[PDB]
Design a protein around this nucleic acid. Structure first.
Lengths: 41, 63
RNA sequence: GUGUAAGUGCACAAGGGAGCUUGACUGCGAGACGGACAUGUCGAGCAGGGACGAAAGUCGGGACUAGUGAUCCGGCACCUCU
RNA sequence: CUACAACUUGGUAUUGGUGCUCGAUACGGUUUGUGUAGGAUAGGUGGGAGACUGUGAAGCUCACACGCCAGUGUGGGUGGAGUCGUUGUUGAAAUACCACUCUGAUCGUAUUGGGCCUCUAACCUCGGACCGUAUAUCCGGUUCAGGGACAGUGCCUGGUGGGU
RNA sequence: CCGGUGCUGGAAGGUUAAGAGGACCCGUUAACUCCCUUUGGGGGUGAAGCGGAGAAUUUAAGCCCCAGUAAACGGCGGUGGUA
RNA sequence: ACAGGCGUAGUCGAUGGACAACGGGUUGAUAUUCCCGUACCCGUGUAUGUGCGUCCAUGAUGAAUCAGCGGUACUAACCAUCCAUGCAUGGGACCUUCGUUGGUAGUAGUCAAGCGAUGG
RNA sequence: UUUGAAGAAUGAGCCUGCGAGUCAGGGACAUGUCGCGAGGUUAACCCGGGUGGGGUAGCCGCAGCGAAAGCGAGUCUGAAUAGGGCGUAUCCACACAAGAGUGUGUGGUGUAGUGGUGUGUUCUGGACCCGAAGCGGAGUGAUCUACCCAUGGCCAGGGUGAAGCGCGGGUAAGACCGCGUGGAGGCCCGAACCCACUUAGGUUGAAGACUGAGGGGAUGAGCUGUGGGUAGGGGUGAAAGGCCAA
RNA sequence: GAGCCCGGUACGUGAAAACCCGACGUCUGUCUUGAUGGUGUUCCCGAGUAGCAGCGGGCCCGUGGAAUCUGCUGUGAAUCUG
RNA sequence: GUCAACCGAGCGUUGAUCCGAGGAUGUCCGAAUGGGGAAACCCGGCACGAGUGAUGUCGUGUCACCAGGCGCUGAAUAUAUAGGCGUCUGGGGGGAACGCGGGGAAGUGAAACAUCUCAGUACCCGUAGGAAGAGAAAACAAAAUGUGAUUCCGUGAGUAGUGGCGAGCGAAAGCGGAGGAUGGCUAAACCGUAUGCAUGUGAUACCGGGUAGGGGUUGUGUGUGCGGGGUUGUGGGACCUAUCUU
């Protein structure tokens, strides 16, 4: 889903970089430990 | 396995039509998946039965 | 001898041969036969457009009687229907 | 004869990551073009009379490719001041420059599936230890240890199916 | 006795579902193109979009296929002559 | 799906385990039940007497301090192996640390009547 | 019921009571009868303590033919006034045509339906009444019987003599052989107990499975007591299609 | 076998208390910091929803060219020139 | 009281017997609820009383489970949660019919039978109410300058259709009536306010303009809560922006 990365995640980008990612990855890796935030504004 | 713990989605009832049009009763169960969710950011994990539609809706919090 | 079973006929030929040809038509059809009903069968004659013939005339398949399957459902072609 | 339970195959959702390995078309593309009129293996149309050059051309030696080994292309070395044009062939020009591309092997950018080995977080464990708990081989939670995107399950689907 | 039917093992091939795939064709009409007439309909072409049938290609088990298995279900012959 | 199916802690469930009474007499009908004689088993109160204990006192004990020395072994080193000088290895010891004993601290401490488990 | 039964085809012991074409629907057809009549008639509902009054929504007649567009006393098929199908209530008279059966026109005559209700059939309802084996839904049953679980009880009496052990013989040691002790066995005979092989009785029985004589097992794969569990397309079955309350 | 014998009938009368219906009030909220008709632009108008696909149910409609409604599984939009 | 009298005793003009309304008492079982249990019978705890020289004994209250509020505590474990403790408010079962939402047969008819019918019937499950459900157009309709929430009754109509086009099944539009409430409330865009979570140019920033302060009506975001504002189809409402103003 459309989201904004929080910290450095390797193979994705640097902090502040917006990335499109599959649902399973985002819901099971990024969101639970705050490596990515959904895009609001 | 047929009643969602979030929205209460239940199985549907119908018939299984054959080539000779023999109608026999059958059931349409929901796609219930057992998911360990995180009710509050405190970290407690509980095993709940949520349909895949609920998972798609983000109503379950598997944090 | 008549394509083919038997019967009824056919030498006046319906049997044999030759020429042209596609009526092995379209719209019909008075009157009948037979039949519980559904089927089935014969049909003069009218109009169109043709074949043969000099003409009169004959031709709506085969000398006749067997060679076939109702209804429902679906396919194809045409229609100035919806 | 017609169905079903049950078992079983595949797709899809739960379901994720990194890499190898293949195929489709898109893009910057190299690449391939043997009637004969002949300097001659002319892809046609174009802007098309001067362009490449010293970001080192003709003439020569090597590597590879195809090879109709006709010979061309690229890479490098060698040499240092040329090929060329309506040059005349022709429907059709110059292989002098520039603007897509068609017969055809290729590369780096996309997307996309196909398979393979893996990683852990989804999920699973009737494996261990603690806690609820005083009693608990139930259950739930925490954690450790293992599998692991497989399995199980949902929808669709092909088979076996007197078991009914 | 493995010829038949089961069971077990193996896919080198043939066939094969759903799902992916959407060539081609058709319906509708924005736009045009011919009329044929007077107080606008009648013929054709027809972009895009929206739809309807939908092909070539890919695909597992199974079946066909290749072997074993009878203390698996089963089977185990006639004719003529001759001292 | 629902109705419901199992089942933990529990709680029921004798046909079993534990648990103190025998002989005689009497009535129209009951009798190890009533009466007679002699017992046995659980509790309650009163009184009396021995005889322990807390308060008091006496025993039983032992824990911990500093200081006095040898072996683990922060680390620099020595020996040997030693890869190429370096290291790893093994061994003696330094510091910390561990073990022994002179003072303290059988004094402060704990226990010593009696009940005693839902636990072993 | 029969071709045919006085019966040797069926049913009835007798009497008194009871016992079989009924009802609903503006249903469908036919036929009486009544009202109105080219019209007839209301349903729901409203108002009346009633059986009365209102209620035009509909329904049936009033024009047919054609699949339909549509036309219309005509219409369809058809190239066709060229014949056929359906229709113009029916009759009468007059003409003109034919004697392929009669037709074509001019006048008259003028068309009868609808709503109650009786009757006979008929449609949907159990539909004249009586009569199965059997099929589904939900429940009740293991106090009989089949098997299993827990916990107890019982088996008079008499025989046979396994393993083991001891002594002796024997041998280098054994093997082995005699004599004793021992008391094993889905062992033997035979009461209680459990079965049920034969025969006789019983067979409107004492008894909806018994009795009299004999018979088999009888320390076991035994019998039995109390408590408990398995339930119908299911149970259980040392397997008979057996048993699951005659 | 009763209008004139009785209980009664026509017709009038009756509630201490409880309950049920109304009515007027206390009480409660509520508008008054308000109301009107005009002018040209940005935002909003109900989301895992509608739509689509697969398998079904029910509609006169038995899958049929099958519209509207609805269950499960995938996929999944727009906010009014929607 | 009565069967149903026979006694024996007594009450009533100081109003009995009897009828109506409201109270008190109401053993035990039964949802049964302190625990147990073969329903109506066994065993208890706590508190306060009664009784005994004391135990025994008696009386009155209270003691089930689950769900939701409120308060305390917060395991493994750190945040915390699960859980535990206490206290209040509810539920549990019964009922003849009617309602709604689910699951859902077979005998039967088709002269057999499987599609179909029977029938969404029988039955079962969950639930109410005095009625229930539906109900205010993302509606019908067909060019009528048409109706205007739902429900129910009569027509439409055994029609259009549907169906191994078999047995059978079978609407809707429209029209006529009963009743009328063509009824109301919200969510969003915007404001104001409070709070949670992040941070903060932490100042020239947020009040409607002009003056002057100030470094937070937070400055910014984001979420939630509350109060305003907004209920619509000729689109409506917020953002604006003039005019008039009880």
């Amino acid at each position: 889903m459309k989201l904004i990365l929080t910290a450095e995640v390797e193979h994705l980008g640097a902090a502040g970089d917006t990335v499109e990612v599959k649902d399973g990855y985002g819901r099971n890796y990024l969101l639970p430990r705050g490596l990515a935030i959904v895009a609001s504004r | 396995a047929a009643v969602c713990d979030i929205c209460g989605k239940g199985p549907g009832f119908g018939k299984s039509v054959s080539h000779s049009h023999r109608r026999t009763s059958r059931r349409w169960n929901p796609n219930i998946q057992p998911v360990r969710a995180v009710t509050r950011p405190g970290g407690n994990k509980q095993r709940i039965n949520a349909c895949t539609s609920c998972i798609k809706a983000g109503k379950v919090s598997r944090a």
